[PDB]
Amino acid sequence: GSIGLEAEIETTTDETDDGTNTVSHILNVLKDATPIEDVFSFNYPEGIEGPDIKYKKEHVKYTYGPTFLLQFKDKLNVKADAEWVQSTASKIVIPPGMGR
Amino acid sequence: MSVEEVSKKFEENVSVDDTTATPKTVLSDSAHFDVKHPLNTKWTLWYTKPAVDKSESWSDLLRPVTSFQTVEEFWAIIQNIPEPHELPLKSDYHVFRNDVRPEWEDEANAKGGKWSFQLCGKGADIDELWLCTLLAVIGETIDEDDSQINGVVLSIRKGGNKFALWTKCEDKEPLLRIGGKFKQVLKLTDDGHLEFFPHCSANGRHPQPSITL
Ligand SMILES: C[n+]1cn([C@@H]2O[C@H](COP(=O)(O)OP(=O)(O)O)[C@@H](O)[C@H]2O)c2nc(N)[nH]c(=O)c21
Ligand SMILES: *SCC1=CC(C)(C)N(O)C1(C)C
Ligand SMILES: *SCC1=CC(C)(C)N(O)C1(C)C
Numbered sequence: 001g002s003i004g005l006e007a008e009i010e011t012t013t014d015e016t017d018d019g020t021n022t023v024s025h026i027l028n029v030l031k032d033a034t035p036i037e038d039v040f041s042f043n044y045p046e047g048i049e050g051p052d053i054k055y056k057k058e059h060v061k062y063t064y065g066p067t068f069l070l071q072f073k074d075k076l077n078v079k080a081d082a083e084w085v086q087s088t089a090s091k092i093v094i095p096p097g098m099g100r
Numbered sequence: 101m102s103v104e105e106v107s108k109k110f111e112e113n114v115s116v117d118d119t120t121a122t123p124k125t126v127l128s129d130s131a132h133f134d135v136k137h138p139l140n141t142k143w144t145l146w147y148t149k150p151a152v153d154k155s156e157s158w159s160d161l162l163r164p165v166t167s168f169q170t171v172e173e174f175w176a177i178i179q180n181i182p183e184p185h186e187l188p189l190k191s192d193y194h195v196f197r198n199d200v201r202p203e204w205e206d207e208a209n210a211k212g213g214k215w216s217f218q219l220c221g222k223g224a225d226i227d228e229l230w231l232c233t234l235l236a237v238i239g240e241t242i243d244e245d246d247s248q249i250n251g252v253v254l255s256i257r258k259g260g261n262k263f264a265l266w267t268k269c270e271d272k273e274p275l276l277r278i279g280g281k282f283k284q285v286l287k288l289t290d291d292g293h294l295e296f297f298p299h300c301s302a303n304g305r306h307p308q309p310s311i312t313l
């Protein structure tokens with residue numbers, strides 16, 4: 001029937017700060033982040049996702065849905081200004097091509 | 101030509117391994133953005149705090165910051181949740197550059213037309229509508245929205261709040277059209293609510309701009 005522990009936990013953690021977002025904290029995340037393929041280039045898994053939202057704006061390339069950007073505001077809660085020059089200066093931009 | 105159906109397990113192959121790459125948006129992250137959000141435009145982020153203007157200088161107050169083609173930047177300043185009725189009035193906020201940059205004292209040279217929206221002050225959920233239009237305008241300038249626009253501006257006062265919309269020009273006709281859209285953004289309803297200020301008058305603050313609904 002049962003030979004061992006059928007209950008195994010895998011990377012649970014899920015517990016950072018008391019729910020307070022800081023510019024240095026988040027911007028610090030960028031210090032060790034990966035590049036970007038573009039909005040619709042990356043499907044954000046978390047009750048959201050920008051597939052064609054603004055992609056219909058014609059020419060797309062770099063169109064960030066109005067509602068999408070909004071979501072950002074939710075997690076962006078971090079009055080920046082200083083760390084900005086520190087991280088903002090890092091923000092990388094990649095042209096959505098690959099195929100042709 | 102097939103369409104959105106997916107009635108076959110051939111088009112897709114359930115199987116992966118060491119799947120290179122690994123993006124992480126601020127949405128799915130919540131505390132670890134492993135990806136930098138870039139755009140195809142240029143826009144700085146200046147926030148004016150009119151108070152020492154008494155004898156300081158419009159250029160001595162204005163605080164220019166975030167100037168990139170991303171979202172985490174301009175979004176932060178929004179995190180301030182100041183909005184058009186959540187921060188010390190008599191304030192100002194302008195983000196743009198796609199065409200010019202200087203300011204209402206030169207940017208106009210660019211847009212040529214200043215579409216402002218005067219509001220007696222409400223305080224509900226206008227900051228979302230005013231933004232959805234601005235954020236999209238700068239974040240989605242590729243076309244459709246900020247087809248050729250130049251930039252946007254903000255200006256709060258006693259009355260309540262007033263947002264400006266700068267357009268490269270592309271003829272005012274198309275503007276009267278754009279403004280209309282921004283009109284609703286103001287959360288009005290037949291009240292007209294709208295302001296048209298020609299650059300030629302913006303700089304020299306000449307009397308009799310264009311109109312004011
Ligand atoms: C926007 N702006 C305003 N001022 C000064 O502040 C005064 C008020 O400007 P305003 O008519 O309230 O402009 P706005 O609503 O479009 O921001 C003007 O008489 C200007 O002398 C400005 N002065 C400079 N140098 N540059 C600017 O961009 C600027
Ligand atoms: S919000 C419209 C408005 C404000 C104020 C300056 C008090 N006014 O005279 C009008 C009614 C134009
Ligand atoms: S502009 C963003 C927006 C509009 C409305 C439909 C009023 N909303 O609920 C949000 C805040 C998503």
Ligand SMILES: *SCC1=CC(C)(C)N(O)C1(C)C
Binds near residue numbers: 212269
């Ligand atoms: S503002 C008038 C105008 C029209 C167009 C031909 C698009 N232009 O380049 C200017 C801005 C001079």
Ligand SMILES: *SCC1=CC(C)(C)N(O)C1(C)C
Binds near residue numbers: 299301303304
């Ligand atoms: S209204 C045209 C105009 C205004 C000002 C900034 C004073 N100028 O130099 C010109 C003549 C272009």
